Design an enzyme around this catalytic site. Structure first.
Site, mmCIF file in Angstrom:
data_model
loop_
_atom_site.group_PDB
_atom_site.id
_atom_site.type_symbol
_atom_site.label_atom_id
_atom_site.label_comp_id
_atom_site.label_asym_id
_atom_site.label_seq_id
_atom_site.Cartn_x
_atom_site.Cartn_y
_atom_site.Cartn_z
ATOM 1 N N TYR D 54 -65.295 -34.645 -7.234
ATOM 2 C CA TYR D 54 -64.627 -34.146 -8.433
ATOM 3 C C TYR D 54 -65.327 -34.728 -9.654
ATOM 4 O O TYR D 54 -65.005 -35.834 -10.097
ATOM 5 C CB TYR D 54 -63.144 -34.501 -8.424
ATOM 6 C CG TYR D 54 -62.275 -33.483 -9.125
ATOM 7 C CD1 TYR D 54 -62.245 -33.401 -10.508
ATOM 8 C CD2 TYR D 54 -61.487 -32.600 -8.400
ATOM 9 C CE1 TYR D 54 -61.455 -32.470 -11.151
ATOM 10 C CE2 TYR D 54 -60.693 -31.668 -9.034
ATOM 11 C CZ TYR D 54 -60.681 -31.607 -10.409
ATOM 12 O OH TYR D 54 -59.892 -30.678 -11.043
ATOM 13 N N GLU D 56 -66.654 -33.793 -13.759
ATOM 14 C CA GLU D 56 -66.346 -32.940 -14.897
ATOM 15 C C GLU D 56 -67.304 -33.258 -16.033
ATOM 16 O O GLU D 56 -67.550 -34.431 -16.332
ATOM 17 C CB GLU D 56 -64.896 -33.129 -15.353
ATOM 18 C CG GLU D 56 -63.913 -32.169 -14.707
ATOM 19 C CD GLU D 56 -62.485 -32.418 -15.143
ATOM 20 O OE1 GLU D 56 -62.233 -33.448 -15.802
ATOM 21 O OE2 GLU D 56 -61.610 -31.583 -14.828
ATOM 22 N N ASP D 209 -77.492 -7.997 -18.717
ATOM 23 C CA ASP D 209 -76.827 -8.301 -17.452
ATOM 24 C C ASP D 209 -77.620 -7.644 -16.326
ATOM 25 O O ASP D 209 -77.494 -6.443 -16.082
ATOM 26 C CB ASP D 209 -75.383 -7.812 -17.478
ATOM 27 C CG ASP D 209 -74.644 -8.095 -16.185
ATOM 28 O OD1 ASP D 209 -75.105 -8.953 -15.403
ATOM 29 O OD2 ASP D 209 -73.601 -7.451 -15.945
ATOM 30 N N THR D 235 -75.979 -12.793 -11.222
ATOM 31 C CA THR D 235 -75.345 -13.345 -10.038
ATOM 32 C C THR D 235 -76.411 -13.803 -9.051
ATOM 33 O O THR D 235 -77.587 -13.450 -9.166
ATOM 34 C CB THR D 235 -74.425 -12.321 -9.368
ATOM 35 O OG1 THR D 235 -75.202 -11.200 -8.933
ATOM 36 C CG2 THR D 235 -73.367 -11.843 -10.338
ATOM 37 N N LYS D 238 -76.538 -10.951 -4.840
ATOM 38 C CA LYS D 238 -76.767 -9.518 -4.746
ATOM 39 C C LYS D 238 -78.116 -9.229 -4.088
ATOM 40 O O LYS D 238 -78.167 -8.635 -2.980
ATOM 41 C CB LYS D 238 -76.705 -8.873 -6.131
ATOM 42 C CG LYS D 238 -75.285 -8.972 -6.681
ATOM 43 C CD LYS D 238 -74.633 -7.592 -6.711
ATOM 44 C CE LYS D 238 -73.916 -7.373 -8.043
ATOM 45 N NZ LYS D 238 -72.592 -6.843 -7.776
ATOM 46 N N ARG D 244 -72.253 -17.063 -3.425
ATOM 47 C CA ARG D 244 -71.635 -16.445 -4.591
ATOM 48 C C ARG D 244 -71.516 -17.454 -5.728
ATOM 49 O O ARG D 244 -70.898 -18.512 -5.567
ATOM 50 C CB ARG D 244 -70.265 -15.885 -4.223
ATOM 51 C CG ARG D 244 -70.316 -14.806 -3.161
ATOM 52 C CD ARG D 244 -68.935 -14.272 -2.842
ATOM 53 N NE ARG D 244 -68.998 -13.141 -1.925
ATOM 54 C CZ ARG D 244 -69.034 -11.872 -2.304
ATOM 55 N NH1 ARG D 244 -68.988 -11.532 -3.581
ATOM 56 N NH2 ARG D 244 -69.115 -10.920 -1.378
#
Lengths: 462, 462, 462, 462
Positions: D54, D56, D209, D235, D238, D244
């Site tokens: 964890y 941040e 994009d 992304t 694809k 992902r």
């Protein structure tokens, strides 16, 4: 058709209605605190050839040409406004173009605040104005709450004064960008020195809407908001005895002088205020209304006007002392300005039934909300004020006689309650019953005989 | 201080400025299309005792009491407005409270549209109004674009007419909730039947702002917008010869009758329109201005007014034919209403230098943008109109003499260009040079001698 | 290239970094309350063939075809979630698609609130989360405050508990449409029965974000928010020992049954919640993450999981009692859940210097704000928690030894303060000085020898 | 409970569903253009010990401590991303934290645009994505249209290409602050040099994009958007064959160098982009997903990957030529990338009935809208693509056999239309009828026998 024909000949129907209104004003008593009679000299300038002029912009920056005379009229009104309040031209400005008081407020929010910004002002049930922001439980009623975010602050129920302690508590959690300091149904003087400290802590502007007490500040009878404020909006038709219009004041010059080395950070209110009125919100100024304001502001710089404002205060304290002797309760225990708030709950009669029965005797007064009110349709108070009857040269001895007609009309209202039930059955009992309607006729005749013997400012038939 | 003193005695300084304005109007020519002289009968009602009345709400739903006479005046103005335009009371309504034309538009957007909704109207450089929405490249100038989203539509550069083909193309991709159909600098009649089809396809309201042609629709000289519209806003001080105010019309009754079985879907414009004016945006109505409008609307239902509107059209076609014979080019090739647009580019002079030199000869006219304009500070056209000089009983033979003074003033402006350079050096050459200033003096004397011999509607000294 | 090659051969560089992380976890102590080790069975489903599947929509309403197996997996996860919390399927629903906890919150605001609506939640310095709305003095930091309006509520400084009295006072003046009831640094149990009364008075929804205590509610050791709530959002990777994801619960069925005659007003949360996730905010669900959550939810319905949650509470009270005997002050006087807040102000050391010196001894802990804090860069507290070391089969006797290493590390931090000044001179004294760096080396060796003898859930080398 | 137990033993029910999915992929044909199989080496890093971390913030600015190893992993992924596209580190940056492609777009709008700003992108029916803004006739469906203002641009119906002429016409009247250049159902290469000129004229940012063609730009087979763009979102799942996730690129350095004297105006994209992801919109990054992306980006810098991208193009042109010989019509006349659009209107069958009958034969394909479509529920086209079957080492000779199964399945669909009526009666005729269901069984057996003989990347049973 030459266009130079009197109204008595061209339109006989409209001329008859114009005379019935003048007769209605001279035979009745006016106790509303937001009304005042206007001088004849101002009315002659309200309807002249200035209506046939179309100028746009500001003096020295006109759109069309030929605006040589109206520039001297608008520049003259900007000098009489800074002198009536004893302001320094190098430290203050004025804008004499808003159509009324409500447009004057919206032009301040659009100039200093982005859409959906936070504003905080006094709540409507507690003595504030609708233009400060107002929302219902199911609907947004005011345009200030539709385009901006608002949150109100309230009074102290057990004293009737503004609760400055709770105001500083919720201001730190809401953090508004603008705080409004103005009332429309308040009997005491606002503490501007305390509200200035709340604005310096959360960093926000302070707006002082003094539309109701504008005539008293000019006569130097009460402390002026200008000592602790940045923007001041006011109307010219409440206590100044002028034509309906609006005014906007703003500071200019150095602000936090000497922040580092030899820097001079200046105020930036001048450009944003002028752009919000034109060409953003308004179009062509009403030049006829601007000329009538300059006639009224000149009358506010005279010794005669100070003697008038001193009588407005003495006529209010005389009316307040007479009510306590009759057996009544005043909100906040008294008055310090031009109006008096009454509480009729001990008397057993509400303000809705009292306002109606007084209307049949040609005594005009509006009901007012009280801190302990369960239902809003039947307020338990009344709002009385002394600025309009003082114009007809009323004195303290004459205001004590007005209370005799008020106390006699309430006693007639306490008899109908013993015979009727619903409020709808109260209005219909004052007409069809020949016994109650006859006693109301003997009281109306004595009021009109008394009020018709005083001078009425204006013209003489319209 | 009795309050009944004439302006000539109480304020000698303001009385002198009020007379210089009346003299300026009677000695010069007025060619602005947005100005018109007002009748004396209307001015007598503009400044009366109605200024001293404070009512809030609508007839039958007043806040305070005693509003018995003003209710009959407001209900009378609502009947004269529906009769001047030959409307059916069962199918139309009217609101006679907005202060002016600009406030009348903002009250329509707030009633029918949520904040940040889409509106489409004519572009400002192409003959539209600022209240329809306007944005710069770096700033939002109009309040309609600050609280709502706007996108304009333009003209056809090679014909000067509105491009209805491109309007239907961009409307399907932008999909606005409201479409405005009104102009302020257009010489042709708008095709309302075509704009109605664009609104039925994308499902949107159609607003018809007819502030400029409001006086011609009442006289039945041009087709009325009411046949294909839902809301109609107009002013009362452009071509109706009345006091400055505003009006709002709306349909009421059944809408798409018989949708299923025996259903009757009604219009819902009545409640939302009345709530947006009060108590949302405005406060107390100006009752004195409402009375002056009822006097002017009664004059619009007379045979005399139709003969006036027929002369406004004949005086425009006579001025247009005289300009073509002198060697000028008109935008769109002519005129169909009350104004004429001129194109001075072939003459070699711009509209900025022409507007200035005409101002020194007491001829008022404003410059206008032309479709082929590279710089906005020097438009190449002028905007002339015939509604105000027609009030002084001008005829076609007199309008041909006005062109002789215009063509003679342009020739003086073509001599200064051969001697100066920058526009700042153009304004300073008309004063310090004794040769150019002397020829300007001989032309000003001939204009004032000609314009002073015609009657002027109004009073007789103010 | 066949695509079936192990990571140890194809990418030698990435395989070495993947082993250094596993060694770092097995040799140090983890005291952060927002971390927990994951089971091996869940990790095998997190990385499988389900990553190569692209479905959009919801079961029975897929876009593409061939989604026959993934429908049974998503419908299986929706039954294990309603059973882990002992919910009635006929009265509750669940959505298992949000990517994490932060996306789960934004999908609730977009479904039930219009843009620029009012939300109220706990303040960040006082133990609330950043997704509840947060603003600085000069900037908007959270996306909830950019698209909505927010106003926080605070604690009681002299007790450390939530001030429910002041919450009901400011709620009547602000009137929010949504109230959040969730904490991230709180040692007591929230009173949901009292916050429900505040929502019924001002009419607003109540959201219960239980991301931190989600594992304790499932084991029935603390009272459940579901008894007094409408929407419940939670994460699956805090106290549930699962893969990172999100969950959203909502009520369905009759609401205020029997309002008149035989009416049944139902809940309308089901349709609006599902539409806000897809197709509004998100695209294709991570089917591999959904399968790992169904493996973890099945482990929460076992007797073994209840014995784990009972030990999380006993390990926190044992760590709290040991700190008081050493001479420390706890915020709010103790703890009731899985974490303990410490106050180091009496000890003369701040939380910034303590967090750093403990990091060099492989003891992870984060500083926490205290109610009496003048500067935000040097908080005077620490936040310790027991859910991750309990997974390694720690007991009460072992948690008392952790305090011996903490108290010994603070004493080393009290020696550097007597030699340094600014905090920047504190970090540089722990390295260049051979005397302080040698004593730190003898303490790190004793911690790693102790923490390496406990089992670590997961795989065995990555 | 040790936590180290295999999924085959702890959860027998979930292990059975995990194997049925692997069998479904190996026995059917995959023609969706948005799917691709993933390498085994990436899946081993997707499910490791990095899930139990964890952190941040960003490297060098962590909140908690102990993030020494994950900083080297995140800094490693930022170097492999700038090298796969041959970018200069001194002129470009990258952000490797967004959860997916849809979150990556919303983080760009929040960083560079105020709320209710104007965006323009390709329309959804014409081949654009839902995240570019989409509205219905009665509802706002996309979150981009709820928080911002959008207006689309369309294609040329008679050619199938983007209409750049109409784009420059409506851009001057709408004036958007951002223009999107990305497609999801387009068979040609976008002209970035022309869209850059439209942005320089109205002064707006250009977003590219390239989520669909991201794998082809890395292999240098088609021109790169980076030559004429400012922001690039993509992304990683694809055409890159990875886990992902999402990526965001931005320029940095000098912008309009040498504007005056020696000034250097720099780009200001770096700070605003990083702040919008954290702490505004997101919380804790998925460190396991970031590690899997770094494994896939390393495989894109190899000669093997270029030979794969060259085969994706040759497999699309071979499938397009085979369809024309069978008697079909292709949208825009052909293809230039990895997908082929078909038009089935001449064949007499719609895309809704064709997509269903192919699903029963284990051939996955989705219907696509065609320019001449009256009803949206029955599109007349299909969308086929070649990136996933190429991973299983398909060649041109094998893609010609896929067309034989497609053309044979359409002929079965042309027989049911001669016997049924409504589409609901079409789905029910493929099951209850034993004659049609038997012919479908003989075709499914021949497809599974053919597709099962090719290698499948991944593991070997899950």
């Amino acid at each position: 058709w030459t266009g130079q024909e009197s109204l008595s000949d061209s339109d006989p129907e409209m001329w008859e209605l114009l005379q019935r209104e003048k007769d209605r004003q001279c035979r009745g008593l006016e106790l509303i605190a937001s009304e005042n009679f206007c001088s004849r000299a101002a009315l002659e300038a309200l309807g002249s050839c200035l209506n046939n002029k179309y100028s746009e912009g500001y003096p020295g920056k006109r759109y069309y040409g030929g605006a040589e005379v109206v520039d001297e009229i608008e520049l003259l009104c900007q000098r009489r406004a800074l002198e009536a309040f004893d302001l320094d031209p190098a430290q203050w400005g004025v804008n004499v173009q808003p159509y009324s008081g409500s447009p004057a407020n919206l032009a301040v929010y659009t100039a200093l605040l982005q859409p959906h910004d936070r504003i905080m002002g006094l709540d409507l049930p507690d003595g504030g104005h609708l233009t400060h922001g107002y929302m219902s439980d199911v609907k947004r009623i005011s345009a200030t709450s539709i385009f901006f975010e608002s949150m109100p602050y309230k009074l102290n129920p057990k004293t009737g004064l503004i609760d400055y302690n709770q105001l500083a508590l919720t201001a730190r959690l809401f953090r508004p960008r603008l705080i409004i300091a103005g009332t429309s149904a308040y009997a005491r003087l606002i503490d501007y020195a305390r509200m200035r400290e709340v604005c310096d802590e959360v960093k926000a502007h302070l707006l002082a809407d003094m539309a109701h007490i504008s005539g008293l500040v000019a006569a130097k009878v009460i402390p002026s908001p200008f000592k602790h404020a940045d923007i001041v909006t006011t109307t010219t038709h409440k206590t100044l005895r002028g034509a309906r219009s609006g005014l906007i004041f703003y500071r200019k010059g150095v602000k936090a002088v000497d922040p580092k080395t030899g820097r001079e950070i200046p105020y930036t209110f001048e450009d944003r205020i002028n752009f919000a009125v034109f060409p953003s919100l308004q179009g062509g100024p009403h030049n006829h209304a601007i000329a009538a304001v300059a006639v009224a502001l000149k009358q506010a710089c005279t010794p005669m006007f100070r003697e008038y404002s001193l009588q407005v205060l003495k006529n209010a304290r005389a009316m307040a002392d007479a009510l306590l002797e009759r057996g009544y309760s005043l909100v906040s225990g008294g008055t310090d300005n031009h109006l008096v708030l009454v509480d009729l709950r001990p008397k057993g009669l509400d303000g809705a039934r009292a306002e109606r029965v007084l209307e049949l005797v040609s005594i005009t007064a509006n009901k007012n909300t009280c801190p302990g009110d369960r239902s809003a349709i039947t307020p338990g108070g009344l709002r009385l004020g002394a600025p309009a009857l003082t114009s007809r040269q009323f004195r303290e001895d004459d205001f004590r006689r007005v209370v005799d007609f008020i106390d006699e009309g309430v006693n007639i209202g306490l008899e109908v309650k013993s015979k009727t039930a619903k409020l709808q059955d109260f209005k219909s009992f004052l007409l069809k019953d020949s016994e109650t309607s006859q006693r109301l006729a003997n009281l109306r005749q004595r009021v009109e005989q008394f009020a018709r013997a005083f001078p009425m400012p204006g013209f003489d038939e319209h």
